[PDB]
Amino acid sequence: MDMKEWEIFYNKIMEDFGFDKDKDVESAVILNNILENANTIPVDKLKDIIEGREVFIFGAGPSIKKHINILKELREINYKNPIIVADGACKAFLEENIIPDIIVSDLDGDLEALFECNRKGSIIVVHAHGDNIEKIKKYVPKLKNVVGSCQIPNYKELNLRNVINFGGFTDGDRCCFLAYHFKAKKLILGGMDKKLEYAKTLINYLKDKIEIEFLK
């Protein structure tokens, strides 16, 4: 029921897995520096897209392609809600001719799917962590409609004004923490399967403050 208790959790994760907290902050400084003169998105356009609505958050589960056709059919009831996809799942929507409204990505995958969705109108939420430094340095200048994310809790005292961090460890949960923060009503998750044990923990935490109904 706090976010500087997330600063505590950040510490438990980094020491748990053994992540260089210093490569973490470094990628956030590189990211904010790049986004000062980049094809960004007024972060308040994501409030229009999310606030009050009933967003869909898609990961990369064993149920990805048979949850997406559910999305297909629900869409032709004049029922179309903002969609958020976790990293590489966008190739699933590119393969079903669905274009995600927002993609939270740390660039870790093959970027062929992500890039084609970007030019088609996606909002790409780039998230900075330790190992994606050179990727952020190369691929963020090649994108449009980009929003910067980072793992470090202490991002506002470091003068990172082109970055926001709304909580979350896996790129999947950041979507919901983004969905929570932008005042979404309920989240309908799809394609949900070590790191996963923390995802369920944070998802459980979101179950209390926001309505969260996994689809099946």
One DSSP character per residue, 135-151 reads HHHHHGGG-SSEEEEES
Sign of the four-CA dihedral 193, 195, 200, 202: negative
Strand, coil or helix: 40: strand
Residue with tokens 């394609």: 191
**What element of type H or E holds 127?**
strand 123-128
User: Measuring CA to CA, which residue among 157, 160, 188, 161 is closest to residue 175?
Assistant: 188
User: Measuring CA to CA, which residue among 68, 86, 75 is closest to residue 215?
Assistant: 68
Domain ranges of the chain: 6-214
> CA 133, 137, 139: angle at the middle one, nearest 5?
110
Q: Tell me the resolution in Å.
A: 2.8
Structure solved via: X-ray
